[PDB]
Chain length 253, copies 3
């Protein structure tokens, strides 16, 4: 995997993604080390691996090792799609865990369907990104990926929201708070695809890479601390032990 | 991923897989929304993602984006094997939860071993499909894949069947009714590989693709609706609630 | 996937890995059949699939169908990295199952992070192996992979060890027993990477493939029977039933 040449402006935006995800992961690891309940531990570990994998994929892209040449000649950062397949289910799992508790006590096949529809969304998106410009198959997969996105929206706004009301009041508030912010940020992703050089090409590759970088920092770092502070607040309102799970394990032995 | 040329008769068989898997997945999604028990919901979304993933892989193949050329020169539809790795464990998951209930509360290692033996089968079958024609590497991996196939057969007819009767008489009948149909349909897959153009070459790639298409429609759409109506009759027999899972969550969430 | 020829001395070491992983997997399947408790059955089939997948990857490498030509010109056995991504989490699953029991009823995200950090380690190690020799990118991913290794060592020596003490004295004794032997053997893998032909190049591709074979044989076959013997001894001290789980299912 010899490093590939990148435009200076594009590589600069990728290094902003590296430094952003690295710092956010370090702070998010603190929420892991200080988790007090299984719900707080699951949410913390999920968010941390979102940032940690995102740091790796931006390091791969910045080092010129996360892109290849499509058949039409464009440069597609496939590493971004590869890790999106793993980070975006962890984000959605956080929503489903908020709505159904940790460990998941009910409606597990709707959680698996959430992850499944999301993984399909990314994978069919990669195919649309690798399809040649101006081709019908490029937008057939775009509409296929958008249909998976619509089903993720439906599960978040329909079944999973119905179960949030069943779980509890504070779980319903946190879920609605986190599901709304996530849904607004994620909506801009197909907009960048449609207008970036992975689609209609209204703006070039550097702008496309920059917007994806800012969206990734928003959906992972900014939203992650937005969500992990709501988890911590819910765990405070729920009256959690003033003890980490590790400290509770040390005293139980 | 620019579309690669495909023989017209082969492309025609791929589209009948697209139309069949697309209509089957839409109908199966109704079984998901109508689910009333955890067992009914687990079985429903499993079959739905079986049909849904099969739709996309036949779409990819029909669009000329689901195959590559092996080093020996043949055209291999690798997309089929790629999604087979995910749709065939979901089918067997349905058998596992029919024998052990949903959620699976015991014998999880035998379910993971079932899924694992199945993934090894498809993955090693891909290597045999990409190995050269008339080589020994092809039939070693064909032999390895057949070994994992026998492991699947043993787990279905052995420990899982022994566990089905422990769950109950209704779960035993459903399991034995669906496992027999599934096992008869799945046996024809290695026969097609053996005689198709990714094996000995009794028939060409068009006939091979056609047989795989029909076998996929049978094992996924035909068997899927055969199976999922069995799990609905089981819930009806056991007195299932008059409310779906969503409607039950709406009652317990409304005020 | 047409086979690419290998050095006969290298292919010889690969075929001894096929023979070793096959022989261990057949015996380990006998432990699967004899499983008496859900804990004993979880460890058995986990260790079995470790040997089985290792048999297939050495078969793929021995047949000349599991290597790659990196951009810099070297030959990398990517099949080994591909299956490492699956077998190494199963090994740590055994330790995690030893510490928390089967099924895992608590601290599930610490097992997922254990698996997650181990996967990142093998994947970033593969990227390090494919990166050109004598380049900064290779050793950037080597350090990144080494950091994921230290996370694995931290979780094993940290929260999992504390949780093994909570599960019971027999599980804590078995956990420390298998965790120390696993940790010592795994430490030798980055040593072979650093000094082998996918690193500094102290020795060529033949010695690197031979050491990985010996290391895989030791960490999977030798350790696997060392671990599964402690698993059966643990359930033996627990007075485990003389019935297998399948025999219990037939009677019930
Ligand atoms: C951290 C990464 C995140 C939150 C990624 C989000 C990606 C999406 C919501 C996907 C968007 C796409 C479509 C719905 C259509 C095709 C193009 C994609 C993949 C950008
Ligand atoms: C929907 C797809 C299904 C049910 C796939 C079934 C595939 C098999 C049962 C596998 C067959 C193979 C062998 C047992 C040996 C090697 C060739 C294969 C992969 C066709
Ligand atoms: C059966 C296979 C086993 C136990 C593999 C273990 C592999 C490791 C502990 C990984 C070692 C690596 C590093 C820590 C840094 C980069 C090079 C690696 C991948 C060999
Ligand atoms: C270049 C040297 C620095 C290394 C770069 C980053 C290395 C990646 C390290 C892995 C972090 C994994 C932490 C997982 C612990 C989870 C805690 C838990 O689950 O309770
Ligand atoms: C420290 C945590 C690291 C997390 C995992 C790292 C994620 C990136 C991993 C490697 C992605 C490589 C993608 C390259 C695909 C082929 C394109 C090419 O290089 O030619
Ligand atoms: C290449 C396409 C990849 C798609 C990945 C799909 C991920 C799995 C899809 C959904 C599985 C849903 C099955 C429900 C599991 C219920 C668990 C149970 O109770 O048994
Ligand atoms: C050219 C445009 C083609 C349009 C194709 C439409 C794509 C539909 C995508 C699949 C949605 C599947 C997800 C359904 C939710 C699962 C239900 C559940 O888990 O409970
Ligand atoms: C946007 C959500 C609905 C999904 C619809 C899928 C495709 C239509 C959306 C954008 C495509 C833009 C117009 C391009 C059509 C083909 C013209 C071309 O080949 O360049
Ligand atoms: C042109 C591409 C876009 C076309 C619109 C596609 C619409 C598909 C949207 C998803 C439907 C999801 C319904 C799933 C029902 C789940 C049942 C449940 O478990 O509650
Ligand atoms: C949410 C998006 C808001 C609007 C953002 C618009 C961005 C426009 C930026 C400049 C357009 C041209 C981009 C220059 C990149 C050239 C690189 C290339 O073409 O390969
Ligand atoms: C609430 C969600 C917020 C999402 C933030 C990301 C959306 C807006 C992103 C920035 C728009 C402008 C992009 C920068 C263009 C200049 C890049 C360049 O061409 O050099
Ligand atoms: C580091 C770059 C950040 C880019 C913008 C981040 C996008 C916004 C992310 C979420 C922050 C929350 C925004 C406002 C919360 C409103 C609360 C509510 O919805 O009730
Ligand atoms: C089971 C439902 C089946 C649905 C009907 C499927 C119809 C398939 C028909 C042929 C597909 C097109 C074949 C490609 C030929 C293109 C050559 C040309 O147009 O010149
Ligand atoms: C959203 C509804 C449809 C679901 C689609 C998701 C299922 C799988 C999608 C397509 C898989 C494509 C894999 C083919 C890549 C082969 C590589 C190649 O030929 O170059
Ligand atoms: C007909 C040729 C046979 C070749 C034999 C060699 C191939 C072996 C293939 C995989 C064996 C899979 C074993 C899986 C059973 C697991 C046991 C369990 O989970 O309880
Ligand atoms: C205990 C093992 C039971 C299984 C027995 C079947 C194993 C078959 C072994 C492989 C035969 C491969 C033949 C390759 C011939 C190579 C000769 C050459 O060209 O150099
Ligand atoms: C080669 C096989 C092609 C398969 C495609 C045709 C689809 C199969 C049609 C329906 C199968 C229904 C199976 C069980 C019927 C249940 C109806 C009922 O309960 O009354
Ligand atoms: C051509 C591929 C699509 C095939 C569609 C097959 C349609 C099968 C529809 C369901 C018929 C069964 C009615 C629902 C279950 C009733 C049986 C029962 O509850 O006991
Ligand atoms: C160096 C070439 C070796 C050739 C193969 C050697 C085979 C014998 C090796 C040891 C296997 C021991 C298996 C233990 C049998 C357990 C039987 C029991 O008590 O249930
Ligand atoms: C019983 C067997 C179980 C193990 C199955 C897995 C065996 C190994 C799987 C595939 C290894 C493929 C290695 C990559 C091939 C590179 C050749 C190339 O395409 O250039
Ligand atoms: C090349 C990939 C081959 C397939 C990889 C997947 C194989 C996994 C096999 C199953 C081992 C799992 C053992 C069951 C442990 C669960 C019970 C527990 O966690 O306590
Ligand atoms: C290509 C990058 C590969 C990344 C490896 C896989 C990453 C897995 C990371 C950890 C999984 C998230 C842990 C969350 C625990 C949830 C369990 C629960 O429901 O309580
Ligand atoms: C120069 C220093 C290099 C350091 C490399 C990276 C070190 C990583 C070490 C392990 C990090 C583990 C973090 C886990 C947090 C606590 C987990 C818990 O017990 O809940
Ligand atoms: Cl990512
Ligand atoms: Cl499929
Ligand atoms: Cl391995």
């Amino acid at each position: 995997m010899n490093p590939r040449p990148i435009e200076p402006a594009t590589e600069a935006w990728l290094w902003v993604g590296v430094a952003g995800m690295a710092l956010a992961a370090i702070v998010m690891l603190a929420f892991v080390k200080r988790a007090r309940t299984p719900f707080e531990e699951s949410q913390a570990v999920s968010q941390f691996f979102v940032l940690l994998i995102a740091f790796g994929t931006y390091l791969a892209m910045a080092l010129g090792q996360g892109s290849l040449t499509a058949d039409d000649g464009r440069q597609v950062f496939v590493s971004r799609y590869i890790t999106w397949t793993f980070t975006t289910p962890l984000l959605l799992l956080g929503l489903a865990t908020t709505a159904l508790g940790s460990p998941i006590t009910r409606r597990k096949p709707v959680v698996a369907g959430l992850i499944g529809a999301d993984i399909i969304m990314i994978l069919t998106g990669l195919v649309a990104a690798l399809s040649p410009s101006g081709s019908h198959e490029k937008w057939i997969w775009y509409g296929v990926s958008s249909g998976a996105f619509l089903a993720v929206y439906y599960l978040i706004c329909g079944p999973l929201l119905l179960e949030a009301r069943v779980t509890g009041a504070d779980h319903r508030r946190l879920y609605l708070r986190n599901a709304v912010v996530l849904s607004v940020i994620w909506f801009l992703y197909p907009v960048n695809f449609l207008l970036g050089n992975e689609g209609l090409g209204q703006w070039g590759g550097t702008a496309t890479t920059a917007i994806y970088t800012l969206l990734d920092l928003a959906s992972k770092a900014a939203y992650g601390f937005f969500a992990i502070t709501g988890v911590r607040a819910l765990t405070d309102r729920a009256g959690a032990p003033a003890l980490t799970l590790d400290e509770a394990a040390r005293r139980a032995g």
